[PDB]
Design a protein around this ligand. Structure first.
Ligand code: CDL
Ligand code: CDL
Ligand code: CDL
Ligand code: CDL
Ligand code: PC1
Ligand code: PC1
Ligand code: 3PE
Ligand code: 3PE
Ligand code: SF4
Lengths: 64, 120, 50, 93, 58, 72, 283, 161, 51, 67, 59, 142, 132, 63
């Protein structure tokens, strides 16, 4: 194949609109009531076209 | 392709949906719904959703969509010769093979430039 | 009701009755277009009055 | 002597009630479709496009004569309905 | 298997073509009388129209 | 007393024979009516034109068909 | 009477329309029962694969499981989320139910044995599939749930591949039959099934069959493990029942289409005795 | 005279809802593991029609099987509220019943009955798959009987008014 | 109502794609090839626009 | 490769009789195609047209009917 | 009537689909889109060309 | 049969299963062949795509060629201690050869009763085309 | 002129052998250099002559009634497919050409051939029927 | 993969058998097409039996 690195990653430059996230990120949570979350994980998942971009795993929902 | 009989059958399907609606109402007789704060709110695995109307996708496959349009058009163009291939001649055979070759060439060019995958 | 409403009802009834009358009595009744008014017999010749 | 069923046969046989009820319902549906098609024609009318052009002309010639030729050859200026609910042309233009 | 199946399908189509030749012969035997009936009915409906036009336009 | 395949044969037969008959006769209890309609569709001698220079008269044809046991 | 007869033409034609409606309702009820039996069959077969009994205490030995499921989905209450558009939230399931009950009109059960004289059965199947895909997408969007919307996007991505795959399969199929009608496919399959020609792309045929029926490995837009439930995250009761019925209707009728166009249609397997079969019987 | 119709239809509705009892795929802990064990081949809930649905909209039963923490109680309450009616609640395990091992903890609700109403309790820790199946079957029997428990009295003609 | 039975029995056509074939593959074949080249060049231009 | 093989076979089929030579190199199309593509055509020069049997007089087996 | 054998074949295909659902894992949308638009579309087009060539071989 | 008779649709709308008619037709054509068996000119007029010797050689050699191919296949690829599969493969190859030979013979019969169709009398031609032996009663009665 | 289409087809299959001169004259009159048909007004006399000869050829022998009925049933169930009914049509035309010879034809029948002919083109389909 | 001598011999066996099988299949397809030609010839001979009449186009039809 040929190079496709520029299509693979997108960096952010200061005050650069093109390099910034020009989209409202789908900040859905992989919450407890989810078959793949084992029921006690609230993974705040920032997605960009279903691509896992940011992770905020809220644990301690089973902390006893 | 059908006719007014197909239209009347669509009407009959609507009437069948009316029958299902009657059954659902009769079932609605058999329970009570109590108003609650989060009962009629969005479900996001047990916690309130932080977005209501602004749920935007990234749409990284617009190249795939436009290629789908073009290649669906090409397949529609290919349909007539295959429907009447028994009467093919030198001209028709050459045109069909050249058209399929052009489709293959377009696909191969799409592959070479890595536009058939997801982008960031 | 109303005068023009009664006039409309009369004209509509006249249209309905005239259309049905010309369908029934001024027509070669060889094609089955009006059920229960034309006969349901099975024909043998090409032109049989239904 | 125990003449019981083979175990694989038993295991696959605890689905045959569902298979039989599916077959009953499907046969009922197909038979109802067949009878709905059959009753008006007293037969299973082969599709119009499944016939050669001469066959197509021969099949509908009687319908043409009974529905269009006789009204056209026995036509009188006072036979047409005064409204716009006349007979549609064979080729809609 | 693909080549053999294409050959078999072509054989079936050629057999259907032979049957079509026979059917076309039968239809040709049936052609002149149906055409005569159609022409007679067509000219009968044209004579009435010609008479109507000649009466109206005179 | 009875082998498993004989005992299994009874159930598959009970599934197949009624289903096969029902598939073979979609117009249940109306095949007789269809036969009567087919018989009534057959044109008789009065319904058709007969040549005057006929080798066999109508009575001769009827007697021949009766002799041959032709079900028609 | 000579003067009373004209008034009765239309009111006498009306019972014929009522009879047609009754026949169509009966056909829809029968095909719905077929779909319910298919659901029970799926439960029993998954029970066989997973070494379990399956439905056994609804009815006697689990005979009325599908009836119980349908009636329960009837009885289940439905509330529309107040942040969602009520009109679309109720209309899209209704449109899906109307479209999914148009599948049986595009079905052949013999030579010219179908409710209508549809010459373009493949075109009709494509149109109905696209309409149901529209319904799935709008179901995902108007529920305003993120998981449901992602399921709708996955459904849209499937139709990008579904369209190409099914169109190329039809392109390769109509090249032999030279017609969109299903009977024309069957007339060429009396000697050998068309799967023999397409044996080299039998894997692709399997892919297409599992892709148009949205079964595994193409069970996308459902994604039980990934997206919670599918497009029906916010839908319960008979809306979810309609979506399930649409899925199973598509499965049943595309299985019928595949059987007709590739596996002999309604012909017994004659290739098993192909070596012992003659070509012609002359004299 | 409307009681002539509803009572047979009452029985039909109860049979339908007990024959398609769909619980929510929501588990928390060791109790959730035992709940998963109560679905697989050895103890088949599909025999009684109990198949798990991933969303509370399509679930009739809320099976609280695990420890409920103060960080999770609003979540459980929202899940119960968003479940479409009619709905029943099964508290499986000592944590769900009354706190269990962690009753004296700073971050444990000490029972899910403090947050949502509980219809039936299964006591074990963890309850065996047989115990969970017993609880589910008892709940199904009760909800079948709950549609007509004899609340309406009988007049002189033995028809409920 | 006029039917040409001689042309009917001399006609072996069994589908409505005959004018489409006679157009895209007999007379308008030049425009058929032009549309193919147009779609190829359009795909190339779409790739370049994405880049 | 298959295209080259079938072209070579088609050019090798010239040894057969006219009805069985390759259709790639010999057009065999319905009567409408035959009439329109050969009308006033001096390259083929097929003569007059048999209206009843839909063929040119110089084409083999034209006007063949029952004895 | 033919619909009996047709129903048999339909049931066989439905059982096959159910078994495949119970058997296979789930693809990804990106994975299957890459597979279809880089491998399977070419397979379909090549098979079509092969069928055309074989038909021209057999006329 | 895969294609049935080339003169009719074998079972178009009604299944005719009369064994006596087939026996009468076969006897009639056998009598016709015997009657002109000593006619040198008629035998010279008989034409067929494939000769009888070639047809017999193919019918008795294609099964043998198939059997040899199957033996080669089971020696090259099959473990020599698995009788069931080895015998099944050999039988399948032999049956493929027999299919080729039987196709040769059936095509010979087809060419025999179509190329020489113009040498039969009118009644025999009608009986062959329509499959009804009643068209020629003088060839099978006595 | 008052005969249904399929019966016209059968009577024409018979009559083509006896209306040969009239058919030839009509066909010569309607010939042209284009597939477009000639104006029927030029061929009216020949068409009427063909119709007269055909009407004279529609008077079947009484013994041919059974064969004509069998052909009618076959054409009805087959929806006008002549090839699927060429056997019964040939039987009818052989009856018409020589009735007494057809009496001998009928006398030498078998038990299966003496049974009533019931046609079902869905249950029985034939071998490689393009028009089905 | 460093295949043994036995594995290499098996690979050679199967590739040679595949090539021979393909060649035999092509030859049999040639034979099948020739048999189809023979069947067409036979049917043409049958169907052109009582169809030896060729009617000339009338002189009123111009070139
Ligand atoms: C409504 C029709 C009757 C009930 C059908 C539904 C049902 O529950 O049937 C099972 C029912 C009892 O089974 P079960 O207790 O539910 O479970 C049995 C176990 O699974 C263990 O299975 P098993 O070994 O006991 O079963 C053997 C298997 C043997 O059967 C099979 O294997 C057939 C199914 C598979 C066919 C091939 C599929 C290929 C894919 O299945 C059966 O025997 C089922 C009953 C078959 C006989 C009755 C069929 C009537 C059909 C009529 C149709 C008429 C046209 C339409 C209207 O069968 C019977 O009661 C047998 C007697 C039926 C007498 C009918 C007389 C009329
Ligand atoms: C009430 C009739 C009122 C009336 O004026 O009738 C005269 C009218 C015309 O009579 P006709 O012209 O003197 O000739 C008598 C027959 O029509 C002569 O009929 P054919 O010999 O032409 O054969 C066609 C006949 C043949 O019909 C039959 O053989 C009836 C049974 C068909 C199979 C049904 C299997 C269902 C399996 C379900 C799952 C288990 O089918 C029909 O006429 C109607 C076809 C549509 C059937 C609708 C549903 C039937 C029952 C299934 C309901 C399932 C609900 C879920 O007769 C009918 O329409 C026949 C009866 C229709 C209703 C059947 C019972 C429901
Ligand atoms: C299997 C699959 C699952 C099941 C599927 C079932 C599908 C079919 C369901 C059909 C349901 C029909 C319900 C009809 C109720 C009704 O109108 O009752 C009138 C009436 C009730 O009058 P009442 O009890 O004296 O009440 C007077 C009030 O005290 C004082 O009057 P009021 O003003 O207080 O109001 C009286 C009346 C309203 O009356 C009025 O508004 C006017 C009349 C009274 C006042 C008159 C004043 C003077 C005149 C003014 C004008 O109110 C009602 O009737 C309330 C009805 C509420 C719904 C009941 C049914 C719900 C369940 C079934 C639905 C489907 C469930 C599907 C589940 C999912 C699957 O009942 C009768 O007349 C019964 C006659 C005896 C025969 C009953 C059985 C006949 C059928 C036998 C075969 C059944 C086969 C299976 C079905
Ligand atoms: C119903 C009963 C069916 C079986 C009756 C006979 C009983 C028996 O012993 O069967 C096993 C017996 C094999 O036992 P064996 O002789 O020890 O074979 C050892 C192996 O070959 C392994 O030793 P090898 O190293 O010699 O292997 C040579 C290799 C050589 O490989 C090849 O030659 C490959 C050929 C490829 C051809 C082209 C394919 C692609 C194009 C199409 O063969 C294989 O790889 C094939 C071995 C496996 C054969 C499995 C046959 C299964 C048939 C279907 C059964 C379905 C049952 C479902 C229900 C079950 C209920 C419990 O199977 C057969 O003889 C063939 C199957 C039955 C055919 C019946 C046809 C009737 C017409
Ligand atoms: C088939 C369709 C049958 C529909 C029958 C009426 C449905 C019905 O009563 O719905 C309940 C609703 C509400 O009825 P409801 O409020 O009396 O329901 C409560 C019922 N109990 C007391 C048992 C808890 O009725 C209506 O909307 C009006 C019905 C017609 C008057
Ligand atoms: C949001 C739209 C996105 C693009 C959609 C592209 C086309 C998609 C087609 C697939 C189906 C879509 C849903 C269909 C049902 C809703 C119709 C609709 O949109 O109505 C809007 C219209 C207009 O909606 P409105 O009232 O909100 O619009 C007013 C205009 N605004 C608000 C902008 C000021 O709705 C109505 O008219 C409501 C009453 C009539 C409803 C008729 C449909 C009901 C369902 C019947 C069965 C339909 C399927 C039949 C199948 C037959 C066999 C194939
Ligand atoms: C800007 C303008 C854009 C629009 C342009 C429209 C017109 C495009 C040009 C069309 C040219 C058509 C040429 C046809 C090919 C040809 O003539 O090949 C030679 C040979 C046939 O030769 P011939 O003499 O006719 O046959 C003997 C019978 N007398 O043929 C053969 O032997 C083989 C049959 C023909 C080729 C078949 C397909 C081969 C592969 C095609 C390309 C695939 C990539
Ligand atoms: C497996 C493919 C198959 O069944 O091939 C059958 C064929 C036998 O010859 P076949 O064409 O069926 O003959 C009928 C009348 N000659 O089989 C053969 O001729 C075998 C060799 C050619 C086909 C190879 C297919 C792989
Ligand atoms: S009750 Fe016991 S088994 Fe259940 S979650 Fe608590 S500690 Fe685990």
């Amino acid at each position: 194949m040929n190079r496709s690195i520029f299509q693979l990653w997108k960096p952010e430059s200061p005050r650069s609109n093109v390099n910034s996230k020009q989209i409202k990120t789908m900040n859905v949570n992989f919450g407890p009531q989810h078959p793949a979350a084992h029921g006690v994980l609230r993974l705040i998942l920032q997605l960009n076209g279903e691509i896992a971009e940011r992770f905020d795993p809220h644990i301690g929902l089973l902390h006893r | 392709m059908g006719d007014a009989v197909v239209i009347h059958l669509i009407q009959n399907v609507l009437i069948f949906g009316i029958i299902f609606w009657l059954l659902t109402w009769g079932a609605e007789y058999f329970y009570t719904v109590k108003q609650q704060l989060t009962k009629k709110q969005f479900y996001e695995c047990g916690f309130k959703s932080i977005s209501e109307l602004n749920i935007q996708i990234n749409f990284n496959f617009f190249m795939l969509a436009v290629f789908l349009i073009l290649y669906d058009v090409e397949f529609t163009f290919l349909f007539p010769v295959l429907f009447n291939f028994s009467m093919f001649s030198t001209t028709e055979l050459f045109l069909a093979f050249f058209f399929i070759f052009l489709i293959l060439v377009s696909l191969l060019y799409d592959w070479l430039n890595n536009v058939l995958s997801w982008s960031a | 009701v109303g005068p023009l409403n009664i006039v409309f009802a009369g004209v509509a009834f006249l249209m309905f009755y005239e259309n049905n009358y010309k369908k029934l009595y001024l027509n070669p009744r060889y094609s089955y277009t009006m059920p229960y008014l034309q006969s349901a017999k099975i024909t043998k010749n090409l032109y049989e009055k239904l | 002597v125990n003449t019981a069923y083979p175990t694989p046969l038993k295991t696959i046989l605890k689905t045959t009630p569902a298979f039989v009820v599916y077959f009953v319902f499907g046969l009922g549906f197909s038979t109802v479709i067949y009878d709905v098609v059959y009753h008006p024609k007293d037969r299973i009318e082969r599709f119009y496009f499944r016939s050669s052009k001469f066959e197509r002309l021969s099949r509908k010639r009687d319908e043409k004569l009974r529905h269009y030729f006789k009204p056209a050859i026995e036509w009188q200026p006072w036979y047409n309905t005064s409204t716009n609910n006349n007979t549609r042309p064979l080729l809609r233009y | 298997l693909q080549m053999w199946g294409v050959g078999k399908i072509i054989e079936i189509k050629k057999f259907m073509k032979r049957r079509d030749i026979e059917l076309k012969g039968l239809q040709r035997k049936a052609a002149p009388f149906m055409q005569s009936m159609n022409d007679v009915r067509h000219l009968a409906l044209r004579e009435r129209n010609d008479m109507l036009y000649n009466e109206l336009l005179s | 007393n009875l082998p498993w395949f004989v005992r299994w044969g009874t159930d598959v037969a009970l599934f197949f024979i009624p289903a096969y008959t029902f598939a073979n006769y979609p117009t249940t209890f109306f095949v007789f009516a269809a036969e009567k309609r087919r018989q009534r569709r057959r044109k008789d001698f009065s319904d058709v034109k007969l040549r005057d220079d006929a080798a066999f008269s109508v009575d001769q044809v009827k007697q021949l068909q009766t002799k041959l046991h032709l079900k028609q | 009477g000579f003067w009373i007869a004209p008034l009765f033409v239309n009111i006498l034609s009306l019972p014929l329309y009522l009879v047609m409606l009754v026949y169509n309702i009966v056909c829809m009820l029968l095909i719905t029962l077929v779909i319910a039996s298919i659901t029970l069959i799926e439960r029993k077969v998954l029970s066989l694969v997973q070494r379990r009994v399956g439905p056994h205490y609804v009815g006697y030995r689990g005979r009325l499981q599908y009836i119980a499921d349908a009636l329960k989905l009837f009885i289940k209450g439905i509330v529309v989320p107040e942040g969602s558009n009520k009109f679309w939230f109720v209309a899209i399931p209704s449109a899906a139910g109307a479209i999914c009950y148009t599948f049986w009109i595009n079905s052949m059960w013999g030579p010219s044995v179908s409710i209508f004289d549809l010459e373009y059965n493949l075109v009709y199947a494509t149109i109905l599939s696209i309409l149901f895909s529209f319904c799935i997408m709008l179901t995902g969007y108007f529920s305003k749930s993120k998981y449901a919307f992602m399921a709708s996007i996955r459904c849209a991505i499937l139709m990008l591949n579904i369209e190409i795959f099914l169109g190329l399969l039809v392109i390769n199929l109509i090249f032999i039959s030279e017609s969109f009608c299903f009977s024309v496919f069957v007339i060429y399959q009396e000697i050998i099934w068309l799967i023999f020609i397409f044996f080299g792309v039998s894997g692709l045929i399997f892919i297409t069959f599992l892709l148009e029926t949205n079964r595994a490995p193409f069970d996308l837009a459902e994604a039980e493990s990934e997206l919670v439930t599918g497009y029906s995250v916010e839908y319960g009761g008979f809306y979810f029942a309609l979506y399930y019925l649409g899925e199973y209707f598509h499965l049943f009728f595309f299985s019928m289409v595949i059987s007709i166009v590739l596996f002999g249609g309604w012909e017994l397997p004659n290739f098993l005795y192909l070596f012992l079969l003659n070509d012609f019987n002359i004299l | 005279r409307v009681d002539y119709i509803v009572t047979p239809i009452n029985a039909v509705v109860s049979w339908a809802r007990q024959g398609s009892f769909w619980p929510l795929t929501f588990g928390l802990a060791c109790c959730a593991v035992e709940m998963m064990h109560a679905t697989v081949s050895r103890y088949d809930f599909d025999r009684f029609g109990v198949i798990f649905r991933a969303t509370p909209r399509q679930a009739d039963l809320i099976l609280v099987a695990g420890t409920l923490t103060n960080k999770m109680a609003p979540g459980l309450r929202r899940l119960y509220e968003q479940t479409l009616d009619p709905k029943w609640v099964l508290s499986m395990g000592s944590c769900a019943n009354g706190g269990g091992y962690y009753h004296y903890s700073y971050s444990v609700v000490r029972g899910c009955n403090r947050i949502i109403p509980v219809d039936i309790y299964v006591p074990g820790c963890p309850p065996t798959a047989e115990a969970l199946m017993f609880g589910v079957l008892q709940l199904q029997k009760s909800l079948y009987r709950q549609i007509n428990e004899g609340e309406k009295k009988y007049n002189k003609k033995d028809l409920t008014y | 109502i006029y039917d040409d039975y001689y042309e009917g029995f001399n006609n072996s056509i069994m589908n409505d794609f005959t004018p489409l074939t006679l157009s895209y593959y007999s007379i308008n074949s030049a425009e058929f090839i032009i549309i193919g080249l147009l779609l190829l060049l359009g795909s190339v231009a779409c790739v370049n626009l994405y880049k | 490769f298959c295209l080259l093989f079938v072209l070579a076979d088609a050019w090798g089929r010239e040894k057969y009789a006219q009805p069985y030579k390759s259709q790639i190199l010999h057009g065999r199309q319905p009567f409408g195609h035959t009439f329109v593509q050969n009308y006033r055509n001096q390259a083929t020069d097929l003569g007059r047209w048999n209206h009843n049997f839909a063929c040119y007089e110089k084409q083999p087996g034209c006007g063949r009917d029952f004895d | 009537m033919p619909y009996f054998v047709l129903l048999f074949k339909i049931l066989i295909f439905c059982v096959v689909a159910i078994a495949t659902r119970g058997t296979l894992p789930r693809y990804r949308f990106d994975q299957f889109t890459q597979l279809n638009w880089k491998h399977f579309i070419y397979i379909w087009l090549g098979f079509l060309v092969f069928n055309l060539c074989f038909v021209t071989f057999f006329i | 049969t895969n294609f049935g008779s080339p003169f009719r649709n074998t079972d178009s709308g009604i299944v005719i299963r009369d064994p006596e008619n087939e026996k009468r037709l076969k006897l009639a054509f056998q009598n016709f062949w015997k009657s002109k068996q000593e006619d040198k000119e008629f035998q010279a007029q008989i034409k067929t795509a494939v000769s009888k010797d070639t047809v017999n050689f193919m019918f008795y050699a294609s099964p043998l060629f198939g059997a040899l191919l199957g033996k080669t296949y089971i020696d090259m690829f099959c473990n020599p201690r698995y009788f069931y599969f080895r015998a099944f493969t050999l039988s399948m190859f032999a049956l493929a050869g027999y299919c080729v030979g039987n196709g040769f013979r059936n095509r010979y019969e087809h060419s025999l009763y179509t190329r020489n169709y113009h040498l039969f009398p009118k009644d025999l031609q009608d009986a062959l085309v329509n499959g009804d032996a009643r068209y020629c009663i003088s060839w099978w009665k006595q | 002129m008052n005969t249904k289409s399929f019966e016209v087809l059968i009577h024409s299959q018979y009559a083509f052998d006896v209306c040969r001169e009239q058919v030839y004259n009509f066909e010569d009159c309607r010939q042209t250099d284009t597939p477009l048909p000639k104006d029927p007004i030029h061929c009216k006399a020949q068409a009427k002559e063909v119709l007269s000869c055909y009407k004279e050829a529609e008077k079947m022998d009484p013994i041919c009634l059974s064969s004509f009925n069998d052909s009618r049933e076959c054409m009805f169930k087959s929806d006008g497919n002549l090839y699927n009914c060429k056997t019964w049509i040939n039987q009818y035309v052989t009856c018409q050409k020589n009735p007494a010879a057809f009496a001998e034809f009928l006398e030498a029948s078998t038990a299966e051939q003496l049974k009533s002919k019931k046609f079902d083109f869905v249950k029985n389909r034939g071998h490689s029927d393009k028009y089905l | 993969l460093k295949h043994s001598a036995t594995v290499l011999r098996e690979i050679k066996k199967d590739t040679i058998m595949m090539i021979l099988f393909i060649i035999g299949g092509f030859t049999y397809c040639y034979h099948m097409r020739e048999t189809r030609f023979q069947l067409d010839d036979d049917f043409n001979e049958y169907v052109n039996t009582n169809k030896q009449t060729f009617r000339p186009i009338p002189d009123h039809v111009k070139l």
